[PDB]
């Protein structure tokens, strides 16, 4: 199936998923000097105090930390959003080297990694229904640069040994995603898509201006994971990012000057 190798990577996705070449695909390059400051953009509301993490899973493309989304416990509101969006899962994209790994780019700059906190619009009842709507998902994207260690990330790093191969999962309760946020909630926003197949065009992207710093030792542990399942030949899980797609008929708004 689809992946990030020479023969099944993003260049090939359009064959099974023709929407790959569609009107609002993600990620994109964020040209900071073309983004329009929009003073009518309300502040982002991130309410994660009652967040309930359940499990961590290696799905063969990345690892997902999954949350109980059966109630309004961890939600995104405000900013460009109408209504309430519940946190369902977060995961990362990263590189084989510190100089690549992010999906979005800022003035063509690639970051070492990118975090995606995925939320769905409660008005649609469940994640599966939400992805069929143009405003079904809100994804908060955070860049990672390599520098000082992120303490709130270490609990994630430590459990990776236990989910090394595709299909492995582990218990992962009492994790607080607030430890993954930068100081500022200043952001860019644009209409886009899932960055993995089926690449559905259902996402309001909210990309934070300020990256978080993680240590080289922390990202190094991401790179020890495997794309392959247990017993299969070993392919390191690295460079699991889709490159920037054409902006086309879209505008990027900024919450700040």
Ligand X SMILES: COC(=O)/C=C/C(=O)N[C@@H](Cc1ccc(O)c(Cl)c1)C(=O)O
- Kindly list the residues in this chain that would bind Zn ion in the complex (CB under 5 A): 116
Interacting stretch for ligand X, rule CB under 6 A, among 2-10, 107-115, 155-163, 191-199? 191-199
User: Is 12 annotated as belonging to a binding site?
Assistant: no
User: Is 104 annotated as belonging to a binding site?
Assistant: no
Using CB under 6 A, which of 81, 139, 163, 237 touches ligand X? 139
User: Is 204 annotated as belonging to a binding site?
Assistant: no
Residues 254, 35: contact at Cβ < 8 Å? Answer: yes
Bridge partners of 75, per DSSP, are 47, 86
Q: 254 contacts which partner out of ligand X, Zn ion, none, CB within 5 to 8 A by kind?
A: none
Q: 118 contacts which partner out of Zn ion, ligand X, none, CB within 5 to 8 A by kind?
A: ligand X
CB of 53 or CB of 195, closer to ligand X: 195
User: Is 7 annotated as belonging to a binding site?
Assistant: no
CB of 3 or CB of 257, closer to Zn ion: 3
Closest residue to Zn ion, based on beta-carbon distance: 116
Work out whether 198 is an interface residue with ligand X (CB under 6 A): yes
- CA–CA dist 156, 150 (Å, integer): 11
Work out whether 116 is an interface residue with ligand X (CB under 6 A): yes
CA trace torsion 167, 170, 174, 175 (10° rounding): -50
- Give me the helices (H) in the chain, please: 127-130, 154-159, 216-222
| DSSP states of 104-172 | SEETTBPPSEEEEEEEEEGGGSSHHHHTTSTTSEEEEEEEEEESS--GGGHHHHHHGGGG-SBT-EEE-
Using CB under 6 A, which of 140, 200, 207, 238 touches ligand X? 200
Task: Give me the least distance between CB of 119 and ligand X, in Å please.
Answer: 10
In 3D space, the residue among 66, 194, 90, 75 whose CA is nearest the CA of residue 133 turns out to be: 194
User: Is 93 annotated as belonging to a binding site?
Assistant: yes
In 3D space, the residue among 236, 240, 244 whose CA is nearest the CA of residue 207 turns out to be: 244
Supply φ then ψ for residue 170, to 5 degrees: -140, 155
87 class by beta-carbon count within 10 Å (0-12 exposed, 13-18 middle, 19+ buried) = buried
Closest residue to ligand X, based on beta-carbon distance: 194
Q: 212 contacts which partner out of Zn ion, ligand X, none, CB within 5 to 8 A by kind?
A: none
In 3D space, the residue among 72, 73, 165, 170 whose CA is nearest the CA of residue 123 turns out to be: 72
User: Any idea which residues carry the catalytic annotation?
Assistant: 61
Q: Which of residues 30-69 bind ligand X (CB under 6 A)?
A: 59, 64
Interacting stretch for ligand X, rule CB under 6 A, among 8-16, 196-204, 206-214, 247-255? 196-204
Bridge partners of 86, per DSSP, are 75, 120
Number of residues counted as binding ligand X (CB under 6 A): 13
Residues of each annotated binding site for substrate:
195-196
By CB under 6 A, name the binding residues for ligand X: 59, 64, 116, 118, 128, 131, 139, 194-196, 198, 200, 203
Residues of each annotated binding site:
91, 93, 116, 195-196
């Amino acid at each position: 199936h689809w992946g990030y190798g020479k023969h099944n990577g993003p260049e090939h996705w359009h064959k099974d998923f023709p929407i790959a070449k569609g009107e609002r695909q993600s990620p994109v390059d964020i040209d900071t000097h073309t983004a329009k400051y929009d003073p009518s953009l309300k502040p982002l509301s991130v309410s994660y105090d009652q967040a309930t993490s359940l499990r961590i899973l290696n799905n063969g493309h990345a690892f997902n930390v999954e949350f109980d989304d059966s109630q309004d416990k961890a939600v995104l509101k405000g900013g460009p959003l109408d209504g309430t969006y519940r946190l369902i899962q977060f995961h990362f994209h990263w590189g084989s080297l510190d100089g690549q790994g992010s999906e979005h780019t800022v003035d063509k700059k690639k970051y070492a990694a990118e975090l995606h906190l995925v939320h769905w619009n409660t008005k649609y009842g469940d994640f599966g229904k939400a992805v069929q709507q143009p405003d079904g998902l809100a994804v908060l994207g955070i860049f990672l640069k390599v520098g000082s260690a992120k303490p709130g990330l270490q609990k994630v790093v430590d459990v990776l040994d236990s989910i090394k191969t595709k299909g492995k999962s582990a218990d992962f309760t009492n994790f607080d995603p607030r430890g993954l946020l930068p100081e500022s909630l200043d952001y860019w926003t644009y209409p886009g898509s899932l960055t993995t197949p089926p690449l559905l065009e259902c996402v309001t992207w909210i990309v934070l201006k300020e990256p978080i710093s993680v240590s080289s030792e922390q990202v190094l542990k991401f790179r020890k994971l495997n794309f392959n399942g247990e017993g299969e030949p070993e392919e390191l899980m690295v460079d699991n990012w889709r490159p920037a797609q054409p902006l086309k008929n879209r505008q990027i708004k900024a919450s700040f000057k």
